[PDB]
Design a protein around this ligand. Structure first.
Ligand SMILES: Nc1ncnc2c1ncn2[C@@H]1O[C@H](COP(=O)(O)OP(=O)(O)O)[C@@H](O)[C@H]1O
Ligand SMILES: Nc1ncnc2c1ncn2[C@@H]1O[C@H](COP(=O)(O)OP(=O)(O)O)[C@@H](O)[C@H]1O
Ligand SMILES: Nc1ncnc2c1ncn2[C@@H]1O[C@H](COP(=O)(O)OP(=O)(O)O)[C@@H](O)[C@H]1O
Ligand SMILES: Nc1ncnc2c1ncn2[C@@H]1O[C@H](COP(=O)(O)OP(=O)(O)O)[C@@H](O)[C@H]1O
Ligand SMILES: Nc1ncnc2c1ncn2[C@@H]1O[C@H](COP(=O)(O)OP(=O)(O)O)[C@@H](O)[C@H]1O
Ligand SMILES: [Mg+2]
Ligand SMILES: [Mg+2]
Ligand SMILES: [Mg+2]
Ligand SMILES: [Mg+2]
Ligand SMILES: [Mg+2]
Lengths: 366, 366, 366, 366, 366
């Protein structure tokens, strides 16, 4: 069987092709002690670093879909194969994922490590938005994939991708966490360390939601108190947040909140559709597929439906497809693809990599 | 039974002799994907290419009645026999059509393909304007046949053709579509791709008409707004056109709109009659037969009646015969001819083609 | 009853002896298609060829009273018996006519065809000018017979012919038609084909007349416009002719207009009278009988009266007998002769023709 | 000195009497721009219109020897006098030419323009075939003159013309150009515009020839490829023609190729001789004089010799006189005639034209 | 003196007629602050917006030759007259330019603003490709004008335009900048904001060039490193690009790189020549005039020469005219035209605009 590893900027999702859910889901972090030992490992990975984060400096080796720390990334891959999955990587072909419009050297270093450090027999790097469409059982649709580092739109029609219409936005979950950390200081809550950033991320996943109309919601939060929620910190302190619950996800639709010039995910989706041929726009309007953890906010599909309806012609039927399992859509689609008999010829074996060089990894790549 | 295939520049009309309507009417197009596949056939033909035109480059194998892409033309013939008609071509004699004054090699290659690729038992290539006269139940008349590529006038009197009076004009429906694409840019509508050319052709068939007096109609469209019509594009956008509705078909009467030096179809019809013997002109004046899709504009028979009346002597009775089924007149006449018992000796069998060579196909051909 | 067939160079006049008018009068033409058939007979005869002359080449089998195309002449005789008269020629004796001073083989071939192809029981070939005198109820007079091919003068006195005084002129209606075609080019009217020659013949029969004084009429046509007449062509075009109306028949009196050296019909008539015995000239002067279609011009009897009066002595009484039915005088006289009881011994039966050979047909023949 | 202007349907040949060649030879065309000027004259004449024909509509003011556009004909005469010859027409008597059997008003309008617009002192309109006989130094012969519009036969014997034997055929070089344009479509070459008609005329003058035996030549062209010739178009495209080289001039001998009913130039020449007196036919048989550009095909004199030999009695000596300068024979003969001292009394002066009216111009005219 | 303003999609070029270079050349941009002021104008135009682009959102009011933001376009015209040229527009006639095949309302709004907002005495809207031909001192040639928004081919022959042969391509410098921004992400360089798009445009103008053979150049860049160039960003960062230098301009010859279906500028130029009359193609082949900033790539004339030579017949002489000043050819030609004495009647004065309405501005317009 093949291994399917979805290395996101935030979470590692690994498992075996044919399964319906990842077997190993843990944070893509490496923690190192920032104090002096007096009485123990030198670095902690994943959930181990998450339980000891009080005395660690946590670092993400992947930033905006681009692997920046290759020594830390190998520790995470090593822990994925030997600790979480407990397999020998030299026996399973490995399907990896990558965001579109990434640097070419990122995929070439991933391939060199898998073939020369882990000695995988074969491997393949798929585009995350294409796997997300396999998971929904579709061949046509525009995928909005938003994870921890990257948000991207990829339109696909009858199995054909339109690379010139691909949009990429370096604004996802990690930027929303940093913005929530900033606006929490308005109530006197100070989260500074990398360990406290993990607390704010947990606050974001529990209490944040997308408002249907942002200006009406800002007036409701300023008048009454029905939007206030409480949250208990790990040390028993209780914090209460009001309009920060919907001001944080609103950055997805108004990136100027964090000083970005780009348009929101609704205009970016609409602009990607308008770059496509006029004859396929009607099918793309009816097949807006959402995937990734950053699309898991309550009310984001209704807000997305409302914003694109206002941009598109009134005759078009806008349909946002947001399954409840869309947090694992890239992995589930990769599990489906790696099990197809037609795909078994797409593997890049170790023999082909030695004779064709690193240039063989850029096939069907955009 | 015999097969009747009317291969126009725009549409394929195929069926069985004895029927009153073609069984298969689909566009004579071959589409090939112009993007990268990521998830499918290599080429699409006919209505299949029309429904996927968003991701295809559409090409017509026939241009101005002359087959230019013989590999694509065989795909269309193959799809006609096996997909649309679902017959074995080696069991039915095939009646084909052709515009007059075509290159000799065009008919010789059509015959070689039908005998050596499809292995038809017998075949015959008729002149389209002669079949159009069979459809109207006449033996005398001048036929104005205008399709997608060619407009031609063929005068016939008591079953005798006058080849020296045959006029051919490389200006038909496809040139009107290209001219409509050009004048639509005056309102800011940009149709560029081959798929968008199919949208403009659909606009032309729905909204364009022939003005009785062009200068009076240009003054009416410039003063009020009663001539404005709206049309919804496939993506919900609504376009509104005014004088473009009658400026596009006016090119048939003023070919200088597209930079051509020839005279309009009314003068060409009159010049063809004046090249005939004086004793038959009165019968030709009363039997102007229209055929083809480009004669389907509302008001073209009244305009044709008005223009030829102004050219002919005032004592002559000008009568334009334009039946509502004239879009299929060539096929209907070919169905009538292929069912005549007298015609059963006109078939060019496979045996005659082997002993007489390709020169046998140029009999009763002009 | 007997058949009377007057085979002129221009018209066939056939009927039954005892009647007062021919039952079948149609042009002596055979037309053959000069174009390609695409949708019909191989040749057309008589009025059928006249209605389809637009697509035919028309040929006269008789030229200057001499049958030149014997295959076409048999088609005309066949159509006369079976289509126009609808009789069996093997049951009726046939009276035929012939111009004087014809080749001997012309009458011998006519007799061989009537006896061996149509199997007539008996036949007789009369001289046309003698029949013309029977029609006027006379035994004395000089007959001026002018048809389509031949003009001839035959003087007869008390039932006796004077063959040495017979004049023959190869100038008749067909030469006048050709001359009218030539002088019509002076006004820009171009009649070239054999079908257009039939149009000019119709113009000649409607608008041409004989001027009493040619030089005074030429001055009147050159000064005013009262002699101009209009004529509508079969295609609606209107032509206008002035002095051509009387210049065409003037060729009969001035054969030098068409390059002939002979004298006009007035001098030829006078020369024929002066070749006769002096004692019969007074009776011939008073009995100038006109016959044939070429004597049907308005004013030809007054002009003939004026010209012969100027040549003859002033004491003689010149009387031109021109009945209104003189276009059929040869047939009417043949109908009278074939009904006489005295003539019933003059028939050349099939039995006499077999035993006496072809030489029996030259009896009372000049 | 006198001016000699030979206004043919195709070329203008002008010069001074006494010279042996025309000083000005240019096409008789008037071109007008058929596009929009954005950056120039309103009309171009002659060689100027020929060098700018790409953006012009070219029109011939003379069609079949008959001046149809009198405003354009005056531009050509104006350019002849002031630009090409650079003379004052009010100082030189002008000898003009005309085809026989032309409309009377054509010569009367030419005379009115020369006397009232150009104010020539005297003028004379000669018959083209008579001038062609002056050029060959003969007084007896039948002239076959074939130019761009008209082909005509004029027999002359000892200085006497036989007008009744004059044949005129509206089939010359321009009809051969149009027929070559038609049969070039058999190889896929499309020449449509008036500018492209000038290209086909240049092809005809370079590659066309008269076959000695047409059926043997058709078999040679269909078997091998030795008759194929190449020709480079003005834009670098190379066309190759085979049997079209001799099928185009064959129309002169088989006018049915273009749907004409008349006989070829060989039968027309023979028919003209047979209309002449029997005593002069032997001299006409030995003096067949060819003139005009349409007699410049290679092998037309040998073919003409062969065809007339087959029609004439075997004892007659058929001699076709075709000098290499016969393209200018009408002008050269007009230069000889205008220099004769005997001719100096034949001029129609301006004084005679005012007192005698337009009727004076029809003297020695047929 | 007259004002000549060449409003391109990218640059404004303004000056006075009679000068040899524009006096004011600045970017056609309007920038507005996208941050909060704490310590200043509300919008910046031209070079002022370019020096403060760090805190601005830059917008082009002209997109693909079509003015989309009319309020911003008036700010640019206002800054052109009063700041850059420092004149009173109510005293100078203004010559404006426009791309062919533009919407009719674009030119009508430009005229209404110049007459009612700036109160110019007269104005004229010329076609840019016609002015480019004035600059090269020619009357014949096909102009390839490629600026920031539009690429168009206009063939002109002897001062006559052929509007039916005009090609327009919505692919120019701005699309090349966007494509360079996309392929720079392959090396890890992220340019996203509108201010960073101006940095990429500066990279394109310094380092990009057209490869003579694209496939050989791709092999050279992949083997060695001689094609690598370095560029210093405004903040001191140094980027290095290799094959992106010639992959960006290659989009002009392979528009499929950016997902466009149209053919490259070489085939578009050849197709425009083949739509012209055959007699003018040789002159168009020798006079390919390049203009605009997008034709300023090193090696584009040699590549254009090589591509058209492969399409045209081998006998034709292909000559690409690319002067070193072709970046200002439209302005220089407009300065020449506005100084011609013949042009002084072409001005559309304020009086004519009031009585004739907005329809007067569409004269000599295509
Ligand atoms: N219920 C939730 N609501 C909002 N955000 C969530 C939720 N669950 C996860 N996320 C966010 O999703 C982001 C990453 O999810 P994932 O799709 O795994 O991205 P990646 O593929 O980059 O690892 C994290 O930043 C996390 O904060
Ligand atoms: N209702 C209509 N009005 C105007 N044009 C039409 C209409 N229907 C069809 N056409 C035109 O007729 C053309 C071809 O019709 P057809 O007679 O099938 O030609 P062909 O025989 O060349 O295929 C097409 O260009 C199409 O645009
Ligand atoms: N009304 C008429 N006026 C002048 N010519 C006439 C008239 N009617 C007939 N003809 C001429 O008479 C000629 C033949 O008449 P017809 O006496 O039948 O001669 P034929 O006996 O040779 O057939 C034709 O050429 C025709 O043109
Ligand atoms: N070498 C040649 N071969 C064949 N045809 C020629 C040649 N030269 C000229 N012609 C033809 O001669 C025709 C006219 O010649 P010309 O005698 O000047 O006639 P016109 O007197 O009517 O102007 C033109 O149609 C031209 O095509
Ligand atoms: N040296 C150069 N090399 C390549 N492109 C250039 C160069 N200089 C200018 N350009 C490009 O030319 C384009 C616009 O130039 P211009 O001719 O002024 O167009 P417009 O008339 O549309 O303003 C810009 O996109 C710019 O990038
Ligand atoms: Mg992800
Ligand atoms: Mg058709
Ligand atoms: Mg008779
Ligand atoms: Mg001539
Ligand atoms: Mg520009």
């Amino acid at each position: 069987t093949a291994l399917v590893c979805d290395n996101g900027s935030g979470l590692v999702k690994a498992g075996f092709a044919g399964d319906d859910a990842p077997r190993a889901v843990f944070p893509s972090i490496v923690g190192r002690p920032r104090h002096q030992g007096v009485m123990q490992k030198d670095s902690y990975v994943g959930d181990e670093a998450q339980s000891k984060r009080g005395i660690l400096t946590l670092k993400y080796p992947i930033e905006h879909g681009i692997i920046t720390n290759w020594d830390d990334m190998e520790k995470i891959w090593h822990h994925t194969f030997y600790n979480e999955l407990r397999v020998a990587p030299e026996e399973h072909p490995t399907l990896l994922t990558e965001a579109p419009l990434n640097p070419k050297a990122n995929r070439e270093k991933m391939t060199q490590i898998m073939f020369e450090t882990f000695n995988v027999p074969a491997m393949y790097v798929a585009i995350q938005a294409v796997l997300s469409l396999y998971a929904s059982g579709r061949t046509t649709g525009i995928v909005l994939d938003s994870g921890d580092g990257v948000t991207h739109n990829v339109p696909i029609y009858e199995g054909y991708a339109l690379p010139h219409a691909i949009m990429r936005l370096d604004l996802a979950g990690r930027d929303l966490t940093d913005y929530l950390m900033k606006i929490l200081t308005e109530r006197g809550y100070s989260f500074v360390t990398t360990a406290e950033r993990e607390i704010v991320r947990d606050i974001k996943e529990k209490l944040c939601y997308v408002a249907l109309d942002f200006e009406n919601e800002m007036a409701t939060a300023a008048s009454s108190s029905s939007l206030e929620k409480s949250y208990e910190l790990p040390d028993g302190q209780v914090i209460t947040i009001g309009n920060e619950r919907f001001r944080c996800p609103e950055t997805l639709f108004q990136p100027s909140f964090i000083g970005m010039e780009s348009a929101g995910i609704h205009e970016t989706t609409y602009n990607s559709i308008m770059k496509c041929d006029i004859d396929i726009r009607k099918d793309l309007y009816a097949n807006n597929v959402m995937s990734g953890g950053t699309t898991m906010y309550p009310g984001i599909a209704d807000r997305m439906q409302k914003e694109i309806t206002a941009l598109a012609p009134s005759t078009m039927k806008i349909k946002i497809i947001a399954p409840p399992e869309r947090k694992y859509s890239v992995w589930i689609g990769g599990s489906i693809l790696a099990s197809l008999s037609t795909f078994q010829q797409m593997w890049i074996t170790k023999q082909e990599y030695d004779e064709a060089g690193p240039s063989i990894v850029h096939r069907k790549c955009f």
